[PDB]
Design a protein around this nucleic acid. Sequence first.
RNA 1: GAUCUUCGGAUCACUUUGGUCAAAUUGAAACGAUACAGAGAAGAUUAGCAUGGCCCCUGCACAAGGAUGACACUGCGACAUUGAGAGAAAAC
Length: 50
Amino acid sequence: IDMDEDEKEMLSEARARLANTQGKKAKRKDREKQLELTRRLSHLQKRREL
RNA sequence: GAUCUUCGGAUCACUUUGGUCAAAUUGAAACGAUACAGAGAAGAUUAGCAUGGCCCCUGCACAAGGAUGACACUGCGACAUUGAGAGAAAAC
Ligand SMILES: [K+]
Ligand SMILES: [Mg+2]
Ligand SMILES: [Mg+2]
């Protein structure tokens, strides 16, 4: 019922592993797009408050 | 002017200007730095060769390099609808 605790750790890591997908370094491009969107939103908001 | 000629004249020669543009802030390029992230292949470290072109850089080069040079690598509707029921409406 409580099969110690390290197995919970490995189960959590396995669960994160099985559904991670999306490669490994594809996480850079989407983040860069999000940051560019944030910066352009800030620029536009600054223009409208001006 | 030189030559003859006979003091009438004839010979000899005959139209430049290489202009990225008028004495340098405002018409020959391409950027330093600081501040942000900050190094490809489904755990982790990592060899590379390619594909695409209004992306180039180094090179004498159709060698080869520049992170495998970099960017890109997805995704949807010439679907005909009927198959049926129900409440409505207009209709077997
Ligand atoms: K490499
Ligand atoms: Mg190469
Ligand atoms: Mg390449």
